[PDB]
Amino acid sequence: TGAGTPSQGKKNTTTHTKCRRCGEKSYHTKKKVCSSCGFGKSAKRRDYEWQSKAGE
């Protein structure tokens, strides 16, 4: 069984769903944690300084 096209058949799982807090399809319903806003992990909002070029 090749790692390409045939392994793409077993892909009927739901992981990332529409978040309650921000609304991006980043709420990992198995982890109950958002990968975009960080809902379920932090009380604060997931923002990072590297999401923009250093001097901007």
Partner RNA sequence: CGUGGAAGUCUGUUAGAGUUGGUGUCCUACAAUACCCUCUCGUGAUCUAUGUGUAGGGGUGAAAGGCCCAUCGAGUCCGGCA
Partner RNA sequence: GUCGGGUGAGAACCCCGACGGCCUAAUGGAUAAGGGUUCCUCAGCACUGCUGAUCAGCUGAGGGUUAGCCGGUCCUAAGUCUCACCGCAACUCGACUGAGACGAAAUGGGAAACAGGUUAAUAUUCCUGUGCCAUCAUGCAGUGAAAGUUGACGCCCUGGGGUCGAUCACGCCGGGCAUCGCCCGGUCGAACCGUCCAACUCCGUGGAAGCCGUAAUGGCAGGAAGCGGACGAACGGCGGCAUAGGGAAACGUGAUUCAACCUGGGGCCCAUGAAAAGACGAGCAUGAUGUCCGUACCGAGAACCGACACAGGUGUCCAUGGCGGCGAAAGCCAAGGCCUGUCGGGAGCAACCAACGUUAGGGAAUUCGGCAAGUUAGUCCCGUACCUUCGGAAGAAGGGAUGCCUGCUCCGGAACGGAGCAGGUCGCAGUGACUCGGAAGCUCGGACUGUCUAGUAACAACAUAGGUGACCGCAAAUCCGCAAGGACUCGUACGGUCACUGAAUCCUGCCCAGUGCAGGUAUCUGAACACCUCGUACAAGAGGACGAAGGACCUGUCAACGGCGGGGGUCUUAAGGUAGCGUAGUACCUUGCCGCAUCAGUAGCGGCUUGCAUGAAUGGAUUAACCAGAGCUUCACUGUCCCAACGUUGGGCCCGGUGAACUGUACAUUCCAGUGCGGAGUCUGGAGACACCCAGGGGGAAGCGAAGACCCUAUGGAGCUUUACUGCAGGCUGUCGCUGAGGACUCUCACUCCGGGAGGAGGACACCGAUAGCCGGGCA
Q: How many CA atoms lie within 13 A of 20 on its CB side?
A: 6
In the list 5, 8, 13, 14, the residue contacting other proteins (rule: CB under 8 A) is 14
Q: Residue 34 has what DSSP assignment?
A: E
Q: Say if residue 42 carries a ligand binding annotation.
A: no
Residue 43 within binding range of RNA, rule CB under 7 A: yes
Size of the site for RNA (CB under 7 A): 30
Please state the residue numbers annotated as binding site for Zn(2+): 19, 22, 34, 37
Interface with other proteins (CB under 8 A): 14, 17-18, 25
